[PDB]
Design a protein around this ligand. Sequence first.
Ligand SMILES: O=C(c1ccc(-n2nnc3cccnc32)cc1)N(c1ncccc1Cl)[C@@H]1CCCNC1
Ligand SMILES: [Mg+2]
Ligand SMILES: [Mg+2]
Ligand SMILES: [Mg+2]
Ligand SMILES: [Mg+2]
Ligand SMILES: [Mg+2]
Ligand SMILES: [Mg+2]
Ligand SMILES: [Mg+2]
Ligand SMILES: [Mg+2]
Ligand SMILES: [Mg+2]
Ligand SMILES: [Mg+2]
Ligand SMILES: [Mg+2]
Ligand SMILES: [Mg+2]
Ligand SMILES: [Mg+2]
Ligand SMILES: [Mg+2]
Ligand SMILES: [Mg+2]
Ligand SMILES: [Mg+2]
Ligand SMILES: [Mg+2]
Ligand SMILES: [Mg+2]
Ligand SMILES: [Mg+2]
Ligand SMILES: [Mg+2]
Ligand SMILES: [Mg+2]
Ligand SMILES: [Mg+2]
Ligand SMILES: [Mg+2]
Ligand SMILES: [Mg+2]
Ligand SMILES: [Mg+2]
Ligand SMILES: [Mg+2]
Ligand SMILES: [Mg+2]
Ligand SMILES: [Mg+2]
Ligand SMILES: [Mg+2]
Ligand SMILES: [Mg+2]
Ligand SMILES: [Mg+2]
Ligand SMILES: [Mg+2]
Ligand SMILES: [Mg+2]
Ligand SMILES: [Mg+2]
Ligand SMILES: [Mg+2]
Ligand SMILES: [Mg+2]
Ligand SMILES: [Mg+2]
Ligand SMILES: [Mg+2]
Ligand SMILES: [Mg+2]
Ligand SMILES: [Mg+2]
Ligand SMILES: [Mg+2]
Ligand SMILES: [Mg+2]
Ligand SMILES: [Mg+2]
Ligand SMILES: [Mg+2]
Ligand SMILES: [Mg+2]
Length: 62
Amino acid sequence: KNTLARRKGRHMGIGKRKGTANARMPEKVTWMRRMRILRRLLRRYRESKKIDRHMYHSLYLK
RNA sequence: GUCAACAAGUACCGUAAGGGAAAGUUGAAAAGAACUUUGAAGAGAGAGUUCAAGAGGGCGUGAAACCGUUAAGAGGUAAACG
RNA sequence: GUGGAGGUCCGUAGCGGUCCUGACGUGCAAAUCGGUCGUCCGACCUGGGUAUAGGGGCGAAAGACUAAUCGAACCAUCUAG
RNA sequence: ACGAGAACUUUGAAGGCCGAAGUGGAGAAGGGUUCCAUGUGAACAGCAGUUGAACAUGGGUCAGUCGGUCCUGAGAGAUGGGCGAGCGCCGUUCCGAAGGGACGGGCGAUGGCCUCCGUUGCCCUCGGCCGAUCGAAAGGGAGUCGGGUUCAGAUCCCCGAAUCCGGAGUGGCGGAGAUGGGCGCCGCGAGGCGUCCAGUGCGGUAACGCGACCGAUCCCGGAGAAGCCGGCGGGAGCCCCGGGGAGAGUUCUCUUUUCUUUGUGAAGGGCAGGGCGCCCUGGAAUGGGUUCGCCCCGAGAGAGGGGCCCGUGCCUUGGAAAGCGUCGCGGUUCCGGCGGCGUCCGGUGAGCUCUCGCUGGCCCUUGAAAAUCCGGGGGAGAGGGUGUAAAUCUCGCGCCGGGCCGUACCCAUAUCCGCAGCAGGUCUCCAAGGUGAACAGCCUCUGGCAUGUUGGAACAAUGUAGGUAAGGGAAGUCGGCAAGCCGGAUCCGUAACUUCGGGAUAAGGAUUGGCUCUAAGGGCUGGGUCGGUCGCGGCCGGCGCCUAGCAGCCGACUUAGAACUGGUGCGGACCAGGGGAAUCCGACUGUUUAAUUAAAACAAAGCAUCGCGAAGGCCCGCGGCGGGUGUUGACGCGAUGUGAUUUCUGCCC
RNA sequence: AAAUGCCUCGUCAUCUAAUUAGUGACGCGCAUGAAGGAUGAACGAGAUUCCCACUGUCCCUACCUACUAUCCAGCGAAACC
RNA sequence: GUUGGAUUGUUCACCCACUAAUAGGGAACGUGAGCUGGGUUUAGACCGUCGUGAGACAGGUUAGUUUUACCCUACUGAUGAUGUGUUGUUGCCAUGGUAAUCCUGCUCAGUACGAGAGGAACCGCAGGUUCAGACAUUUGGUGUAUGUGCUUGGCUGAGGAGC
RNA sequence: UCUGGGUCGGGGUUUCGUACGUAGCAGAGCAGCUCCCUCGCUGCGAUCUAUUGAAAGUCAGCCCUCGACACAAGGGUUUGU
Ligand SMILES: O=C(c1ccc(-n2nnc3cccnc32)cc1)N(c1ncccc1Cl)[C@@H]1CCCNC1
Ligand SMILES: [Mg+2]
Ligand SMILES: [Mg+2]
Ligand SMILES: [Mg+2]
Ligand SMILES: [Mg+2]
Ligand SMILES: [Mg+2]
Ligand SMILES: [Mg+2]
Ligand SMILES: [Mg+2]
Ligand SMILES: [Mg+2]
Ligand SMILES: [Mg+2]
Ligand SMILES: [Mg+2]
Ligand SMILES: [Mg+2]
Ligand SMILES: [Mg+2]
Ligand SMILES: [Mg+2]
Ligand SMILES: [Mg+2]
Ligand SMILES: [Mg+2]
Ligand SMILES: [Mg+2]
Ligand SMILES: [Mg+2]
Ligand SMILES: [Mg+2]
Ligand SMILES: [Mg+2]
Ligand SMILES: [Mg+2]
Ligand SMILES: [Mg+2]
Ligand SMILES: [Mg+2]
Ligand SMILES: [Mg+2]
Ligand SMILES: [Mg+2]
Ligand SMILES: [Mg+2]
Ligand SMILES: [Mg+2]
Ligand SMILES: [Mg+2]
Ligand SMILES: [Mg+2]
Ligand SMILES: [Mg+2]
Ligand SMILES: [Mg+2]
Ligand SMILES: [Mg+2]
Ligand SMILES: [Mg+2]
Ligand SMILES: [Mg+2]
Ligand SMILES: [Mg+2]
Ligand SMILES: [Mg+2]
Ligand SMILES: [Mg+2]
Ligand SMILES: [Mg+2]
Ligand SMILES: [Mg+2]
Ligand SMILES: [Mg+2]
Ligand SMILES: [Mg+2]
Ligand SMILES: [Mg+2]
Ligand SMILES: [Mg+2]
Ligand SMILES: [Mg+2]
Ligand SMILES: [Mg+2]
Ligand SMILES: [Mg+2]
C-alpha cells in the first residue's frame, strides 16, 4: 500500500530522496531510452513513405 | 649407580636437526574383606582374614615443614633469646 | 549534448594501522580490543606450487626480515672453553 | 517430563538476537574417529549437570563417468662428459656410436582348418616428441543424471533413464560401396538369355548440404590455447505485479483479505531466439545505412533471396508410473501401502546473480606450455570382372570389459594453529523482503541459536563505556587533547592562486513532512472507398482519398508545478565533509622499523655522469673456458649521484 | 635569526589588553648557498601560528544509565615473604 | 590571606588587569603503583659545524609503549571488644580536634589639618569578598517515574493497541 | 488496644495536553450515480470541530481514607547479683 501511494506520487519528495538524480535515474539511460524511441519512429515513417531517404537521414543527425 | 633396577631412548616437546623424564617394596600365603546395615553413589558402621590392617590394591618403615583435634598453661610495648 | 579517461575523488568488502598517548597491562591475547582514522583499478590484495641458507640469503633501506630468536638464526660438538 | 537430585537437559509455550559480506547451507588445507547409537556419572568440560567433542561398548566411508592417476609449467634431476683428496657436485644438450621402431619389400626355419596364415629370424626400405625422469586433489584433461533410501553412507547403494573409452582371431546383423548402359536373340508386351563396356557415392549458380561415402610414409594446419577494464544486448535463476485453485491466519469492526504452495534431469529430435568480415542478384552523390557509443560502403552500401554456427530457452521422447500439495481409506501399525483431487493463466524490469554474445578502451605491460585430438594436401598402394560381387565403411543396431587409492565428520566465538572449549589468526561457493544511490546502517522471513567458562540479591565510593547541562565560550592545557559542530539531496552561488587540468562539496544561502491534485515523458493493434458480387467467409479487379493522423487497448517508473494541512515540524531513527587565512617540508599515488618512530625517511618520473662492441663490461664460483646478465647487443646491459615541472646551476685540478 | 643564528627573548613592523610564539622585513651569515640553490599549483593520519563556527576543555560542578566493585551460594589462583 | 591572564617546557623572567596585598622559603631540589610527558629524553630522520671515515656535538629540528596493591602500617569511614550480674533508657566529661575572614558604601565631613592643593579617623549604619556549615520553598540543572504527547525505519492483514 | 498495619479501591494533589469510538451542510480536491436531482446523494480524503482541560499516569520514599478483602500471642537463639 506504499508502492500504491508512491506510484501516485506520494512520499517521493525532495526530503525523501537521498541519492543524486543521476544515481536515482541515470541520464545515460534516459538518453539511451530517448534515442531508441526517436530512432524507431524515424524508421517507421521511412518505410511508410511519409518521409523519403533524404529527409530521414538529415533528421537522423538532428 | 648408565638417561633408563619399571610398557626407556619410552611418554612428551620441537617444522626439523635434535632434546628428553617421572616412576622399585601388601603379605609367608590373596587368606584381596563373605554377610548385615545407612546412603542415589562415593563413602561409613558392624562382621571377617592375618602374628599384624597402628600391612586394605602407588598398600614395608613412615621423619620434618604444614594442618585438625584434645589436654595444660598464658596473652595491651611483635615474637623469640641470655 | 554524447562519450566515458584516470598510479582520479568520497566511500563498502578487503588491505593497513593514525590518534585517543582510550581499554588491557599476574590480560581474552608472550601485542589483543573500542572509537576515530589511511587506501580501496592498482607500484592492488590473496591461496597453492617453486627459487634463494648463516658472514650467507633477501631488503621501495628500518640494520628490516630470515619459525614468539637477528649489529650474524637454530641444533649438537670442541667444552667441565 | 525424566530423575536421588534441575537456574543450566528435553518437550511445549512466550519474549528476543544473528539478519543472506549470517551466529545460515557446503567445501579446500589441517585434524584423525571427534562421526552415529547405547550405557555410565569417578575424574575432565575453571558454577552445576539427568548434558558432552569426556569415559565405556558397538557400528559406520561402497564409483568405467567425482577426484587421484595422465600432461606439461616455474623448476627439480640422473646418464655421456667434466671437476673433485673424497662422501660426491657441476651441468641438462652441453666434449655421446644417445633411434631396439615401423605398414611394407625380401630372404624365411615353418609351429598351423600345414589350400595356408597368425607368429617369427636376418636383409631391404623408412626415421630429429635433439633429450631419461619428476613437477598442479585451483592450470590442461573423453564420459552421469533424476527419484528413493540410513541412527551414521551416497552424483558411489537401490530403481530408472543414459553415456564415454577399449576390444572382439572364430568377423554378429543391416545399410553404404553397388549393381548401370550398349549390342544381339527372345518376349505382342512387362521380361528373359547371350555379349561388350562402366562403376573407390550423390545434390546446390553459390555459401554448403546429404546416414555411410577407399587409401600409407611424409607434409601444411586447426583445436587444446589465453590479459585487464568499460558499454550494450540475448537467455536463465531469484525478486516483483495481476488473477485461478488447495491449505492455514485474522474476523469486536473492516478486509472478493494476509500467508504458504502452485515441478520436468541427462542424452536425443524439432522449433523459437541470438550471432555471422558467409553466398547470390544488383550497382549507390541530392551520398546512404546505422549504434547508448560507434562504425560500414565500387576491395560492393541499401534492398531482396539464401547459407552456416550456437541453441543452457520452449515443445516432444524421457513423463508421471516419479515428486510435491491437499483430502481420505486401510494393515504387515517399522508397508518405496491404497484412493481421490490438483500441480493453472498472465504481465513487467537501467532490478539482482550467473552465463552467452557483440563492440570498444588501455599497454616502453601484449597477457603459458604440453599430453591429447582433428581436418586438409598428397598420392605409394589395394579391390573385383558384371556378381545378390570384392577391398573398404568416421552409418544404424548388437556383444564383452573398465582394475588400484581417497570417499565418515569438523572447517571454526568448541573438532585446525596459537600449552586451553584462548575476543587472535586461517583459502573459497550460494545470498530473500522493506527503507535507500547501495552486497551501507536499521528491522523482518527461510535457517540457526541461548548471550559466549556461573547464578542470586543490592544500587555505596572509585572506575570503564555512554548521555545531558543554566550563564559564559578555550579563560583549561605544552598543545582545542577529547568531545562538539558540520553532514544526504535539490536549487542557487562560488575567491585567491594556478603547471589552465585544478582550487571546489571552496566559501555562503535557500528548500525538504503529510495529503489532494495537475501536467509531461511510452508500447502494441486497426487508416480498405463498392460484396463488382456464392469455393455467413473468401477468389481477381471498376469502385476511394487516413496522407497537419485518428481510433482501440496496454504499460512502467520518474521529474516539475499547485492547493490544503500540522504547536516551524519535516535528510525527524539510521546513514552522513566543521570551515578560513598563512608559514615549514616532501612534487604527487606508492613504501617503511611484525611487537614504542608512518615521517620531512626510502621509492619515484625527470635530469646527469660512468663503463663496455662479446677473447667484452659488471658479477658468481672449492673446482672444470664452469655460471648469471643473456631467448641480451649501445634506443643495450651494468655502476652511481640527484630527485616532477618552472627557473638556474658560479669559481677552484 | 630559516628544520641551519652562538650571542638571542636579535632589531623594526604587524597580530594581542598583555606575545620568549607566528608572519613580513633587514643582514660582513658563531657556522646559508647552487645536482643541489630559489620557486610553484595539486596532494599530506607530516610540523607550526591565528581567525570563524562549536562545544563540560574549563569557571564548577551536578545528575542519570549499562557493566563492575560491593554482599551471598558454588569454584578458586599468583606476585612477594 | 597572598589572585585571573599573554608569551615560554620552564623554575625564573617580563608584561596586561585586579586587589587590603599580589612576601620569602621548607618537607628525598615534598608529592609518577597520583596524573601529565611539554624539557631532557635509546633505536627513525633532517640541518649546521667537526671528522679521510665509521661517527661526534654541554647546538637547532621532528616522531617516539609511563607496568603492579588483594599484604603490613598510616589515614578515612564501618562493626565490634574489656569492665559495671543481665539488659535498657536518660545523662556527665577526661582527652583530642576547633574557624571565621577581610573590604567597600553611607555618615562623621568636604570637617579636623593645611597658605593652598588637597584631605582623614572613632562611634553608627548598609552591604559585599574569601572560607565554613547546611538546605531544596523558590529559579536552574538532571530525568529510564520509561510519566505523557509528537515522530523516522521496520514488524503484528488493516483500524485500534503495541513492540 | 480506643484494634492494628497491609493489599486493592476511592478522593486530593499533580504531569502531559484533549484519548478511542461516534457525529458533522468542516475539509484542498477527486471519483461515481441521473427515473433521481432542480442542484442532488453515494464514495475516497491529510486535517479540523463537538463529544473532551479529555484520556493516560501518580509512591514504589506524595497526601487523606475507614469502602472492600485478608492477616495479625506465631516462631527461632541466648542471658542471673
Ligand atoms: O602489555 C604490556 C606490558 C606492560 C608491562 C609489562 N611489564 N613491565 N614490567 C614487567 C615486569 C614483569 C612482567 N611484565 C612487565 C609487560 C607488558 N604493554 C606494554 N606496555 C608498555 C611497555 C611495553 C609493553 Cl609490551 C602493552 C603494549 C601494547 C599496548 N598495551 C600495553
Ligand atoms: Mg606390626
Ligand atoms: Mg606394617
Ligand atoms: Mg620392607
Ligand atoms: Mg612406601
Ligand atoms: Mg621383610
Ligand atoms: Mg605405610
Ligand atoms: Mg586452653
Ligand atoms: Mg595507551
Ligand atoms: Mg587493571
Ligand atoms: Mg572472555
Ligand atoms: Mg641507524
Ligand atoms: Mg660475530
Ligand atoms: Mg669449574
Ligand atoms: Mg544489531
Ligand atoms: Mg554445516
Ligand atoms: Mg559452514
Ligand atoms: Mg566444573
Ligand atoms: Mg556427537
Ligand atoms: Mg607427472
Ligand atoms: Mg562427505
Ligand atoms: Mg567457548
Ligand atoms: Mg550480557
Ligand atoms: Mg548465560
Ligand atoms: Mg553549558
Ligand atoms: Mg591559554
Ligand atoms: Mg593557565
Ligand atoms: Mg579529536
Ligand atoms: Mg582552499
Ligand atoms: Mg611524501
Ligand atoms: Mg613498530
Ligand atoms: Mg605506530
Ligand atoms: Mg654527483
Ligand atoms: Mg688533481
Ligand atoms: Mg621564505
Ligand atoms: Mg597564542
Ligand atoms: Mg620571520
Ligand atoms: Mg658549502
Ligand atoms: Mg657546481
Ligand atoms: Mg610515591
Ligand atoms: Mg608513571
Ligand atoms: Mg617528546
Ligand atoms: Mg634519536
Ligand atoms: Mg651544506
Ligand atoms: Mg665535512
Ligand atoms: Mg495506528
